[PDB]
C-alpha cells in the first residue's frame, strides 16, 4: 500500500508531513557500505519507531527521523496510502484559501494519486 506517486511541486511552496504513517520508507543517500539501505517506520501493537540507522562517507505514526551525517536535498520518501502532507508559504505571500487541506494519498480505482 505504498504511494507510487510523488507529491505535487507547487510554486513558492514547501511540503512536509508532520507525522509519518506506519509503513513509510526513507531511502538513505548522500558511501555507506557495510549495510543499511532505507529506514522503515514500523512497530508492535503498542509502539511505533524507525527500524534502521543510516551512515555515510564519500500515536499510530512515527515522528520525523533526526538528520544524519550527510543527506542532500528534500528527502526522497516512499509514503503509504492515506498519508497527508502540508504546504507552507515561505516569503511568498498568498492566502486567498483560508483553510489549508491538500495532498493526500488515495487508491483511485487501482492507481495511487495525490
Amino acid at each position, epitope marked *: 500500500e*505504498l504511494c*507510487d*506517486d510523488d507529491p505535487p511541486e507547487i510554486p513558492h511552496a514547501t511540503f512536509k508531513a508532520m507525522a509519518y504513517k506506519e*509503513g513509510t*520508507m526513507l*531511502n538513505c*543517500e548522500c558511501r555507506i*557500505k*557495510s*549495510g*543499511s*539501505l*532505507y529506514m*522503515l517506520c*514500523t*512497530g*508492535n501493537s503498542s509502539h511505533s519507531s524507525w*527500524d*534502521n540507522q543510516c551512515q555515510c562517507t564519500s500515536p499510530g505514526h512515527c515522528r520525523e527521523p533526526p538528520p544524519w551525517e550527510n543527506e542532500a536535498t528534500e528527502r*526522497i520518501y*516512499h509514503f503509504v496510502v492515506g498519508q497527508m502532507v502540508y504546504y507552507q508559504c515561505v516569503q511568498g505571500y498568498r492566502a486567498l484559501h483560508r483553510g489549508p487541506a491538500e495532498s493526500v494519498c488515495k487508491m483511485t480505482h487501482g492507481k495511487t494519486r495525490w
Partner: antibody
Amino acid sequence: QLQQSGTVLARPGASVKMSCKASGYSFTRYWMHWIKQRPGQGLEWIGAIYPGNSDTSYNQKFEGKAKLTAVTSASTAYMELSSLTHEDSAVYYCSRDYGYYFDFWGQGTTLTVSS
Amino acid sequence: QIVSTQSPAIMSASPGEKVTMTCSASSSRSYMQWYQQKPGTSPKRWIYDTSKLASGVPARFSGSGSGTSYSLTISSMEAEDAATYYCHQRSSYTFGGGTKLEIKR
C-alpha cells in the same frame, strides 16, 4: 509482475547476464533484490539495487562476482555473473522489497555451469 | 555482518502436534521475518516484524522472540504445512539455513 529470463548454460570461466522484467508498478520507486539458491541448500542474498539512481549494495561474498544494473526505460533489472564455477550453478530469484518483506518474486533462473 | 542460524535443519511432525523451530542472531536485532518455500516455487512471505502474520497465513502459525533469539510455532500441525522455513532480517538481508518440516507417521 516479475518475469525473469529462461534457463542458461555456461562453461567454467565464462560470464552470464540474466534479466528480470518488472511490470504493473513504478520500477523507479522500489528496491530490487537478487537471491541465490544452490540445489538442495538454502537461500543466499546476492545484493540489491535502487533503479531510481542505480544505488547498489552487495553481500561481501559476491563483491566481484555479481554486477547489478538496471535500464529504467525497459523496466528491467539485470545481473551479470563473472568467472563462473560449479558453485554458481543454482536458481536465481529477483524480488521486490516492500520494506516489511519481499512481497513479489520471479519464477527464477536456473544457471548450470559445466564443461 | 549479521548471520542467522536455524535449528533444527530437519524435523518431523504428526498431524496435530505442536511444532517449534528456532532462529538465533549473531548480533541483536529488532525484528525477524520468516519465509516459506515448497519445491518448484518461490519463497513466500509468512511472518514479518517477529509476530505479525501475512495475508493468507493460517492462525495456527505464530511468531515469537526478541534480542538474538526468535522462533516460529505451529499450534496444530497440518499436511499443508510441510515446507522449508527460512528466517530473514532486514538489517543486512541474510537468510537462515532453513528448517525443513516434514510429516511424521
